[PDB]
Fold this protein.
Amino acid sequence: RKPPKGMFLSQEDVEAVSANATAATTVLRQLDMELVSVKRQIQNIKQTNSALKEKLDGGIEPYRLPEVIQKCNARWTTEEQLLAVQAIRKYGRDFQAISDVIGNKSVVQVKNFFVNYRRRFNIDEVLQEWEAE
Amino acid sequence: PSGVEGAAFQSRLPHDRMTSQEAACFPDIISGPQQTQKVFLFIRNRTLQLWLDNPKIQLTFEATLQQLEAPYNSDTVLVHRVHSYLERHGLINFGIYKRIKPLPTKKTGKVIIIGSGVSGLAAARQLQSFGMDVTLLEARDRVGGRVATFRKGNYVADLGAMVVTGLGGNPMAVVSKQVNMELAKIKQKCPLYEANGQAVPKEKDEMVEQEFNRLLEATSYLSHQLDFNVLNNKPVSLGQALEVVIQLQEKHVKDEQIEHWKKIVKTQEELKELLNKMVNLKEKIKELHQQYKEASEVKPPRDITAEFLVKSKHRDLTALCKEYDELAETQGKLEEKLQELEANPPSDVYLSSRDRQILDWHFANLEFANATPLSTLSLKHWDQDDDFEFTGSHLTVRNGYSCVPVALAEGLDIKLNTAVRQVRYTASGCEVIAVNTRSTSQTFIYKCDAVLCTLPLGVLKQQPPAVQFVPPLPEWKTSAVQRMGFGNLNKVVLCFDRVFWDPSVNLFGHVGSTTASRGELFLFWNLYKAPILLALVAGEAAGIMENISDDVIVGRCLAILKGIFGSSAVPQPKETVVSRWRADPWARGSYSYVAAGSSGNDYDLMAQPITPGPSIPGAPQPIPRLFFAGEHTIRNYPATVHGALLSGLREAGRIADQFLGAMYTL
Ligand SMILES: CNC(=O)c1cccc([C@@H]2C[C@@H](O)N3c4cc(C)c(C)cc4N(C[C@H](O)[C@H](O)[C@H](O)COP(=O)(O)OP(=O)(O)OC[C@H]4O[C@@H](n5cnc6c(N)ncnc65)[C@H](O)[C@@H]4O)C4=NC(=O)NC(=O)[C@@]423)c1
């Protein structure tokens, strides 16, 4: 009902190998070629990504900045208020980025800010200006 | 098996149902009540037992019925019918037995037997014990046919048959109790040896062997599951099928390699796309760093847009610094995967050049068994007789297998050096025309009621005919003759003055440097008491080594043996015999094989007797006159001695039924 284990025989397979007198060496010799071209295609890309690893010598260690470990406050000094309105203009509703800029406010009171100070800082208009970007 | 049941088995009979042949002789019993069939079967098996348990004395019907018990011995005609059926068809009282009843003073009918091979001899002994007058015509100066045995001094070696294939159901078991035969078991340990001269490593032998066995099953799969039995309007041979299996394994290796490296590219490129992401991101991080740095250069106090711009670039830069770190994990997660894949690659080849040379040895062994190159064996049928294999070890005959025919010939009218040239068969009888092989001018004419041809198939195949049939054989017969296969297989007997090989191995192998010569001196046998090695020439090598002189052949044997045992342990041989069975005009081969395009049915065609036409037109349909036997005529046990013998036993019965009547069918 099934071939011995470790033996591969397919109805499909046998006709292609038997169809002419040389169909065996022909079928076999495409695959030696298909193997050698993939092999040379490997050593190609193996050398292109060699180059790109050298363009990345040292990673980005010099360009890194130290962590700003800053306890989260709750009151809104005018300074952190004006930083806010500018981030809204640069970041839309990504309130994580905006919470990162201002530093000492968590993502919820950024949401809260959007509503309490919504009238006075005229946030609606700012967001429309950001949309045009 | 044991009991009356073991007797049925040891006579190739099922204990629990009746054969077609008993159905023919006992149609009353078969079609009758299930209980009566059972009584018959016990009577058969019990009588078979009584014979087998002692085959050096005739088993008389009276002796039979006395060891029987009620209710089995209540019916004497059933017992007398069964015993006579068994006697007539050579299941009991065959071979060399002492006759309780001396044979009738005067004989009935006259049979000429062409050939005193084992099949001829077995028929002649049966017919003569049935009360017929029997003469055998033998072209050679000796009996035995293809059972040839070399004898010089105490050197003894078989040039023909030498192996008894296991006593479980084998009539040669009976013959062995009858004629003393020093039967020695064959140890199946066969150490192989490369052309370099050194042994094959034990891991390698077992790989290649098992691949050989797996390759065979695969052809079977091709044959019975994929109906790949005709290709280009021609029947597929075994060898064709093996190539196609080998090529598909070779193909599937290449398919695995391609699929492997095709994963390597599909990740090297997923890496490439990752590194181009990390160049173009590091160059953004260069640029934001400069920008953040300049913005940090504007000294405080700063208006709020300038403070936003520091704090903004700082967020933006740590953001890109995180994408570059996440990517550097993904870079790390692809780098080891490439290392893992590269270090677990699939198999480089299917079989190395050394591998395929050891596999070619196993193919030579198989070409040996079937006495022909595998490109001639029918893929569908080459193994049609494996179901009737006997149980037990194979054996050899230390004292020479000629002792069997020589013994059968005791008491028989045999005309040696008598070659048949024409066989004439007509409605009233037959006349066989033979010459003397020494001087061919002397001509003899033998007249008889029936001829039993046991001419080897290679002789019947000969064009132009060695033997002429008058009238010619019908097309259905001559076509079976053309379709069948007659193979070829030779031996080199090497006679030394001292043992220089391992005495504990019966047989050892030589691996050929090429496929074409895979059969050339590929195997050696230590079967005898005296220092004799015996070397086989199988496959396509058999027919070609026959145009090579003895000395050149014995040279190549010594060469191969030097490489095994060192150039100084091999003496020059004292005696050397080289067989050439395809050259032998009374053989013209070694034995039959199921050719591609043929089938087991041809073996039954070969066995059908010939009935001549009527002498006077409108006269009644005559008797059959020309009968056939020998190894090429027994479907289930072709190409062996036990099969030859069985075919003689069966023609004797068929001929006796025809010419003495068969009173046991009422
Ligand atoms: C598929 N095969 C397996 O499964 C199998 C299985 C197990 C073992 C074997 C082996 C193989 C080998 O290792 N051995 C063997 C070796 C050789 C070299 C040879 C040559 C044979 C064997 N036989 C076969 C065995 O030999 C034979 O098949 C029988 O012997 C045949 O006998 P028969 O049919 O009577 O024909 P003859 O040819 O004998 O008789 C005819 C008479 O006609 C005379 N004659 C001709 N022309 C004329 C004329 N014009 N006028 C008058 N007479 C004429 C002629 O002179 C002769 O006298 C083997 N079988 C074994 O069992 N054991 C072995 O050991 C094995 C294989």
